[PDB]
């Protein structure tokens, strides 16, 4: 522990919306300090979204205006994508970093496959 709960795959309709769940159980002493969502480009995961103490940032231009990440409750950092494009099909990684009181960081990630259905 902690571990992320993310489904193996999700579907969304072309030009519609989809949610990519990413949830976890908050743990005493584990302060969430970073969230990233990444898209897989071959061997390399590429950040598309970052949340840190400065707020939320979309990191790849093709997702501008189309990406939100849940922030109402601790432990839910699910990603919402809108106006889905066929080229949004990909493996996506949810990645969360926590810091404990001693300054150690703990990182967890988990993958889903998004399939965009015409």
């Amino acid at each position, epitope marked *: 522990r902690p571990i992320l709960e993310v489904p*193996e795959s999700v579907t969304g309709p072309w030009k519609g919306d989809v949610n990519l769940p990413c949830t976890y159980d908050p743990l005493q002493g584990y302060t969430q300090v970073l969230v990233k969502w990444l898209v897989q480009r071959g061997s390399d*995961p590429v950040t598309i979204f970052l949340r840190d103490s400065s707020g939320d940032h979309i990191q790849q231009a093709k997702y501008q205006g189309r990406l939100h990440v849940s922030h109402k409750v601790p432990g839910d950092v699910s990603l919402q994508l809108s106006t889905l494009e066929m080229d949004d099909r990909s493996h996506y990684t949810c*990645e969360v970093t926590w810091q404990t009181p001693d300054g150690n960081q703990v990182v967890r990630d988990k*993958i889903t496959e998004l399939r965009v259905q015409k």
Partner: nanobody
Amino acid sequence: QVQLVESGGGLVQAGGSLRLSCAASGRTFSSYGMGWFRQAPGKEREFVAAIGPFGYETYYADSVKGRFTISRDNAKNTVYLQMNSLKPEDTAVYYCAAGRWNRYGFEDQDNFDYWGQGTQVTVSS
């Protein structure tokens, strides 16, 4: 439906080697990370090695680095552990496991959703 089936354990002399195999069936595991763990009787299970889903990314416990090699053939959904330069303290039950981590958390047993049955490795002088 899903099972991870291990094989290849047995008795070897120190300095010898074994190949463990973990055949995963019931679904495609090409985009899963795979791991090996080991446990001695009455002791805690501990990390041995892992291989990520993407690229060519392998990870090892310090105690086995340079001696053990994890590898996979995705066309057969099988992960291997080549255990070279074996030592008596490598004696344990070895388990494979599969999960959907990418780069992180591969030593956390909670992060693997499917586990093999274990196979016994014994190394004698």
